Amino acid sequence: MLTMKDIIRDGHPTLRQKAAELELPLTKEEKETLIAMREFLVNSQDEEIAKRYGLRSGVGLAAPQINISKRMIAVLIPDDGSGKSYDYMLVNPKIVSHSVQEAYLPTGEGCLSVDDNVAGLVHRHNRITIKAKDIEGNDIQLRLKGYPAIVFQHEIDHLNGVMFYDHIDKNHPLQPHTDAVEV
Ligand SMILES: O=C(NO)N[C@@H](Cc1ccccc1)C(=O)O
Numbered sequence: 203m204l205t206m207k208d209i210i211r212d213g214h215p216t217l218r219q220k221a222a223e224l225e226l227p228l229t230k231e232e233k234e235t236l237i238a239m240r241e242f243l244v245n246s247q248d249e250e251i252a253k254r255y256g257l258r259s260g261v262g263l264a265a266p267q268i269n270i271s272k273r274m275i276a277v278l279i280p281d282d283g284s285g286k287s288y289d290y291m292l293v294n295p296k297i298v299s300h301s302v303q304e305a306y307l308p309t310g311e312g313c314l315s316v317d318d319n320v321a322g323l324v325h326r327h328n329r330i331t332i333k334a335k336d337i338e339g340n341d342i343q344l345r346l347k348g349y350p351a352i353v354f355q356h357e358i359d360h361l362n363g364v365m366f367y368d369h370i371d372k373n374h375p376l377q378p379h380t381d382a383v384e385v
């Protein structure tokens with residue numbers, strides 16, 4: 203199983219590289235590392251396993267964060283309210299379209315790879331369409347709004363060497379953009 207030992211930290215140069223596109227089919231090694239990335243998120247969300255193994259709670263993980271410079275992401279967003287849950291292991295995820303209207307978490311964002319908290323709103327697209335492959339090479343198209351769109355944008359950022367804190371207005375960090383939706 204993966205643990206916080208496996209997650210590299212702000213300053214590691216792998217987090218600032220552009221992740222390489224994967225060829226398909228995936229190698230067994232690649233499937234296994236993507237299943238383990240999901241398993242980490244699952245483990246990080248069980249309070250007993252997470253206490254026992256000192257896991258931070260996470261809803262998304264990009265392979266660069268375990269120092270693998272490949273374009274795979276895991277998202278595990280539990281039901282929490284609506285009936286909408288998100289459980290996705292994506293290969294070569296790409297945002298193909300998005301809203302002009304922005305969205306932000308009113309408390310800013312966190313990062314398993316970031317030991318500090320950073321204050322500041324991170325404005326993202328309220329709505330996105332993603333095309334990607336699943337672990338078996340089949341085609342996935344996601345239409346996402348609000349919380350999940352923000353999480354996926356966070357994870358895809360990692361594949362392009364971008365960190366949540368790069369989006370933070372240096373002067374007015376807690377000023378919401380006009381007509382930006384609060385999630
Ligand atoms: O750090 C990772 N993945 O990179 N995952 C974040 C996801 C996230 C995104 C935006 C706001 C809050 C949280 C986490 O702490 O669960």
Ligand code: NI
Nearest residue numbers: 312313314315
């Ligand atoms: Ni992060």
